[PDB]
């Protein structure tokens, strides 16, 4: 009925199309168990959201780098910020780990006991941490626009858009890493080199991707 990752192949039993972006792609059966699939769903959503933020930041910084704005590349921004501003790298790492630890720990214990964070033990906030579904934490803090509490069809469509954009951003980040390790320049520099000559500037002519070329 619904389209799958491999046309003609029947979708697995653990993938019935209830989740967003369900194409029945699981040849290794890594998510056959329900709890394991739940954990992997939250992991994929977090991965896609982080990948989306990273892809947007990398694209914007490379845009500012191509134009005469002085923006450093994404593979040198850390050194530029730490050396330009008197910022201690271990101190920043510890602060980031503290904030991420608090947020991810609350999220983890909410995954173990759904709705437990809504008891009011954190400054009295209750409905802001009640949670809607697995990997979809609705509330006035995470969703102040209230898009998750109205027009169910639009919400499901946005869920499909979010999972697809997340997978695309993950592939984009992997492409950024491979492009930097193979060509040595930024993603927009590679795009300009390819647009200048697409027949001779690609992965088949970089001299690194195909060793027999």
């Amino acid at each position: 009925v619904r389209p799958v990752w491999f046309p003609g192949n029947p979708p697995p039993a653990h993938l019935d199309g209830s989740l967003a972006g369900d194409y029945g792609f699981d040849p290794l059966f890594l998510g056959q168990e329900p709890q394991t699939l739940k954990w992997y769903v939250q992991a994929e959503l977090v991965h896609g959201r982080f990948a989306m933020l990273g892809a947007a930041g990398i694209i914007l910084t490379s845009i500012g780098a191509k134009v005469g704005l002085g923006f450093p590349e994404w593979y040198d921004a850390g050194k530029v910020v730490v050396e330009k501003n008197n910022i201690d790298f271990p101190t920043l790492m510890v602060i980031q780990f503290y904030l991420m630890g608090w947020a991810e720990t609350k999220r983890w214990y909410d995954f173990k006991n759904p709705g437990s964070q809504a008891d009011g033990s954190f400054l009295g906030f209750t409905e802001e941490f009640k949670g809607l579904e697995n990997g979809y934490p609705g509330g006035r803090f995470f969703d102040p626009m209230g898009l998750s509490r109205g027009d169910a069809a639009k919400y499901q469509e946005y869920k499909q858009k979010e999972v697809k954009n997340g997978r695309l951003a993950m592939i984009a980040c992997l492409g950024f890493a491979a492009q930097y390790a193979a060509t040595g320049k930024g993603p927009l520099d590679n795009l300009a080199d390819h647009l200048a000559d697409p027949n001779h500037v690609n992965f088949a002519t970089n001299g690194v991707s195909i060793p027999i070329a």
Binding site: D88, M93, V94, Q117
Partner: protein, 217 residues
């Protein structure tokens, strides 16, 4: 139910009515050291003694150290006060420690006997008439008589809250002394000096910059 981890499975032994009667019950026992009720009672006594001892020690370290920063006092550092106090003293540290061990052993033995049998210290004809006052209240570790001269434990409405201010504060004091030791082996200065140095530049003076608390960085 207040908990040390919202959503974590609270242990069954910490959910009993007797365990919840203790002050500062937050369901924190990942190692299960309080499963045995006798062990839980003994550890509750140990926690109370540690809380009071840590509070007195941290107070004796922090207040004279804060007065030394100002012109109120000239008390040396806590890690150097022993040598300075024993220099111009009337007895060596060995004789003083011997008298200390004797005097502390007597009262700790009496406290141990009362822990083994509550109210047993009130044996008639055993402490020159003072044995009657040596019997504590119904709760172990909360005696009356010579202790608590102001009698602030007679009002029950605040009693349950009073104990909450004794354990929690004590727990904080227990960590405070720990910091006092760690900082001593990390910066080489006193606690008040470490606090001032951190307040001078918090973004570059902490445990992630001394090179001792983070050797991989």
């Amino acid at each position: 139910r207040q908990s040390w981890l919202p959503g974590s499975q609270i242990p069954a032994h910490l959910d009993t009515p007797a365990a919840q009667a203790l002050a500062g019950n937050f369901g924190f026992d990942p190692l299960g050291l309080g499963k045995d009720p006798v062990a839980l009672r003994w550890y509750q006594q140990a926690e109370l003694i540690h809380c009071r001892t840590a509070m007195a020690g941290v107070a004796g370290i922090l207040i004279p150290g804060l007065l030394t920063k100002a012109g109120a006092l000239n008390v040396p550092e806590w890690y150097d006060a022993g040598k300075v106090a024993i220099e111009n003293s009337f007895a060596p540290w060995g004789s003083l420690l011997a008298v200390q061990l004797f005097l502390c052993g007597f009262v700790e033995a009496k406290r141990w006997q009362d822990i083994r049998k509550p109210g047993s210290q009130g044996e008639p004809g055993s402490f020159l008439g003072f044995e009657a006052s040596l019997k504590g209240t119904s709760e172990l570790g909360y005696p009356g008589g010579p202790f608590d001269p102001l009698g602030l434990s007679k009002e029950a409405d605040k009693w349950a809250d009073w104990k909450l201010k004794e354990v929690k504060n004590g727990r904080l004091a227990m960590l405070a002394f720990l910091g006092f030791v760690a900082q001593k082996y990390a910066t080489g200065a006193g606690p008040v000096d470490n606090l001032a140095a951190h307040l001078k530049d918090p973004w570059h003076v902490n445990y992630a910059t001394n090179g001792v608390s983070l050797p991989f960085l």
